Amino acid sequence: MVPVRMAVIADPETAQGFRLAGLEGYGASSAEEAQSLLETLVERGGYALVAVDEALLPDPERAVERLMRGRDLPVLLPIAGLKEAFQGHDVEGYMRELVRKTIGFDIKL
Amino acid sequence: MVPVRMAVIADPETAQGFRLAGLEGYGASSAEEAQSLLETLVERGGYALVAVDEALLPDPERAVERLMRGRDLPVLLPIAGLKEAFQGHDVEGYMRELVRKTIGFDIKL
Amino acid sequence: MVPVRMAVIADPETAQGFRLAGLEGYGASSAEEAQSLLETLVERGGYALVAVDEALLPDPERAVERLMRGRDLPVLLPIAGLKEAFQGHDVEGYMRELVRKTIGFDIKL
Amino acid sequence: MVPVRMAVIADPETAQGFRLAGLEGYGASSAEEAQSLLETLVERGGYALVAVDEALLPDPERAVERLMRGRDLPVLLPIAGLKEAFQGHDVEGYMRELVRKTIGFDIKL
Amino acid sequence: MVPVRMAVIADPETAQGFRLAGLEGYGASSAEEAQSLLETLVERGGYALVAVDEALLPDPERAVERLMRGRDLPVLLPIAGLKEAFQGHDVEGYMRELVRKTIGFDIKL
Amino acid sequence: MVPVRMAVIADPETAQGFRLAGLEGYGASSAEEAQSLLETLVERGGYALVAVDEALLPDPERAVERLMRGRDLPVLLPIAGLKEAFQGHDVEGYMRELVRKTIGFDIKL
Ligand SMILES: [Ca+2]
Ligand SMILES: [Ca+2]
Ligand SMILES: [Ca+2]
Numbered sequence: 001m002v003p004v005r006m007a008v009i010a011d012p013e014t015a016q017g018f019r020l021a022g023l024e025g026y027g028a029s030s031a032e033e034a035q036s037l038l039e040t041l042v043e044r045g046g047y048a049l050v051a052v053d054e055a056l057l058p059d060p061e062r063a064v065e066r067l068m069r070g071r072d073l074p075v076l077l078p079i080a081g082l083k084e085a086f087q088g089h090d091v092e093g094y095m096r097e098l099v100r101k102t103i104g105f106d107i108k109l
Numbered sequence: 110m111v112p113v114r115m116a117v118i119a120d121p122e123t124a125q126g127f128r129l130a131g132l133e134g135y136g137a138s139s140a141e142e143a144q145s146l147l148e149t150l151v152e153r154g155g156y157a158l159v160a161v162d163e164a165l166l167p168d169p170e171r172a173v174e175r176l177m178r179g180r181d182l183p184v185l186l187p188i189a190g191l192k193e194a195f196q197g198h199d200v201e202g203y204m205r206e207l208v209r210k211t212i213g214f215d216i217k218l
Numbered sequence: 219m220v221p222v223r224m225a226v227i228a229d230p231e232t233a234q235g236f237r238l239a240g241l242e243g244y245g246a247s248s249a250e251e252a253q254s255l256l257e258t259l260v261e262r263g264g265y266a267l268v269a270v271d272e273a274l275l276p277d278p279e280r281a282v283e284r285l286m287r288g289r290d291l292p293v294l295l296p297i298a299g300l301k302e303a304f305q306g307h308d309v310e311g312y313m314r315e316l317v318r319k320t321i322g323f324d325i326k327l
Numbered sequence: 328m329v330p331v332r333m334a335v336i337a338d339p340e341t342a343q344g345f346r347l348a349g350l351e352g353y354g355a356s357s358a359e360e361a362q363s364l365l366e367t368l369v370e371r372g373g374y375a376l377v378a379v380d381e382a383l384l385p386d387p388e389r390a391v392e393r394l395m396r397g398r399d400l401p402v403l404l405p406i407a408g409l410k411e412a413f414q415g416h417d418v419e420g421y422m423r424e425l426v427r428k429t430i431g432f433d434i435k436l
Numbered sequence: 437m438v439p440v441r442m443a444v445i446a447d448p449e450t451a452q453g454f455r456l457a458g459l460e461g462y463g464a465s466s467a468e469e470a471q472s473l474l475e476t477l478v479e480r481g482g483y484a485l486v487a488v489d490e491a492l493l494p495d496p497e498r499a500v501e502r503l504m505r506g507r508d509l510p511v512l513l514p515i516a517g518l519k520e521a522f523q524g525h526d527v528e529g530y531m532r533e534l535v536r537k538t539i540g541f542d543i544k545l
Numbered sequence: 546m547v548p549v550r551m552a553v554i555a556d557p558e559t560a561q562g563f564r565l566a567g568l569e570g571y572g573a574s575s576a577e578e579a580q581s582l583l584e585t586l587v588e589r590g591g592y593a594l595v596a597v598d599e600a601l602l603p604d605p606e607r608a609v610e611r612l613m614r615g616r617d618l619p620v621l622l623p624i625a626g627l628k629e630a631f632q633g634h635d636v637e638g639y640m641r642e643l644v645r646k647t648i649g650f651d652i653k654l
């Protein structure tokens with residue numbers, strides 16, 4: 001059974017009070033500015049709950065939408081006939097070309 | 110100049126061929142296996158690119174939408190009086206009741 | 219005693235409840251996402267039991283078998299007369315050639 | 328692009344010879360010691376190819392089938408109404424008891 | 437003072453049940469498979485006792501006998517006059533030629 | 546194709562000279578210091594080869610026999626009726642009693 005871990009986002013004064021009382025408080029002074037803090041926490045995904053002063057989280061739904069979309073992803077390339085990289089003998093080569101011809105990259109392998 | 114790391118998702122025999130060639134090949138026998146491989150690769154972190162047999166990724170956009178999304182989220186909680194939680198002299202107790210009052214679920218702090 | 223580690227896979231809001239309560243819940247919205255979850259999980263060897271919402275696991279037998287079949291395997295090459303590789307002065311090259319005769323894939327040793 | 332690694336499973340003396348020659352040889356004196364080495368190599372994870380002295384491999388289809396079944400089972404327990412672990416505030420109690428009804432087993436959480 | 441580490445080897449269903457109870461159960465279905473399991477545990481090192489279903493250990497003296505003949509060893513080469521290697525300036529080359537003079541093998545150092 | 550690892554066990558100053566020339570020298574001043582070092586190298590696991598000064602190796606077949614046939618074993622306990630440990634209600638303690646029962650030793654589990 002696991003530690004439940006909770007973050008609190010409030011105004012910087014208030015967050016310092018939270019800190020001094022033994023809780024995990026984070027200062028934010030505007031909303032957008034809170035939202036970025038949230039991605040960072042759902043990032044470092046210790047937390048079961050983030051309590052946010054409501055003036056700093058007026059649209060809970062929209063904030064959710066945005067964190068999810070800050071995930072840096074690799075490029076994904078679908079390919080027809082991967083099998084045919086074994087037809088010859090520079091497989092690495094064949095993929096370097098394959099990719100280069102698809103996305104225009106001399107992807108730096 | 111950072112290293113470009115590429116992974117390859119193909120049918121299991123094809124994935125074996127890539128690995129024998131010194132490429133990072135991973136085998137999957139279906140769409141949903143491919144997607145779970147994507148999450149593992151994302152979770153791990155250093156891939157600029159995943160190349161996927163397109164019978165296993167017919168829809169890079171859908172797949173991307175699940176990587177950004179998949180996330181289990183924290184209960185995100187906008188709270189109307191965090192500042193009042195310094196009025197008493199047990200902040201930890203006040204906050205525990207504030208969650209319980211609110212979302213019904215008692216939280217384990 | 220050694221702990222017993224359990225995971226619970228459920229509807230996304232019930233999963234958050236499990237987290238708040240100190241258990242190790244995971245949200246999933248369909249049967250797919252749920253086996254995609256399983257996959258991701260079952261390679262993280264720690265869990266002894268997995269409790270899954272009946273709705274997201276209409277067949278606990280077949281879900282097993284999918285997961286068994288998901289393991290990436292080295293190519294297994296039985297060889298007669300492995301020892302012959304020491305008749306000459308080139309075991310690496312002997313082996314690379316043996317692999318190629320046998321499996322067609324020219325391994326990069 | 329990565330190190331291409333092969334292991335060789337042979338009789339102890341032969342395995343010593345391969346290790347002298349720069350290859351990763353493991354010695355086995357029975358089929359089961361080889362099957363155990365296969366599983367260990369696989370669970371370690373870095374091998375594209377495993378060569379095995381045929382005299383050590385009674386049935387290579389079977390040996391794969393065992394590696395596929397060798398992921399080593401987290402008991403799986405489909406459950407009707409997980410939601411209602413929030414009727415009363417002992418989510419854990421409920422779980423250990425439910426599990427005990429279902430699986431006929433106590434569990435140590 | 438430090439708790440005695442014990443493993444249990446039993447048929448897979450039972451082995452699963454010992455795990456749910458917090459104990460270290462490992463599943464096997466034959467005398468040979470089980471001896472393999474003894475050897476992996478023995479090599480792996482931390483156990484003071486292994487309790488084995490007798491159906492899986494019908495000959496436990498022969499079992500000991502074997503555990504202690506599965507250890508992979510280096511080739512052990514006694515040499516006269518190892519010093520004399522310091523008289524002519526290519527110690528590594530001297531040693532290469534030595535080993536080859538004694539066992540036939542050109543070693544890759 | 547991997548680097549071949551060799552060690553050299555010789556008198557302390559000869560071993561220092563092996564190190565100054567880039568080889569893996571280990572000093573021993575007695576037969577029993579030499580046998581310790583072999584055990585330590587065997588136990589690390591890499592070495593294709595261990596060259597030992599003959600003066601430190603009174604009996605090489607004894608040396609090998611001690612390597613195989615000497616490391617400290619797990620007591621090995623065949624048991625009748627392990628299944629019967631669940632059909633109590635306290636497996637952990639039913640097991641404490643059953644091993645004491647047998648060997649005589651209230652072992653520290
Ligand atoms: Ca981003
Ligand atoms: Ca989820
Ligand atoms: Ca796979």
Ligand SMILES: [Ca+2]
Nearest residue numbers: 354355506508
């Ligand atoms: Ca061995």
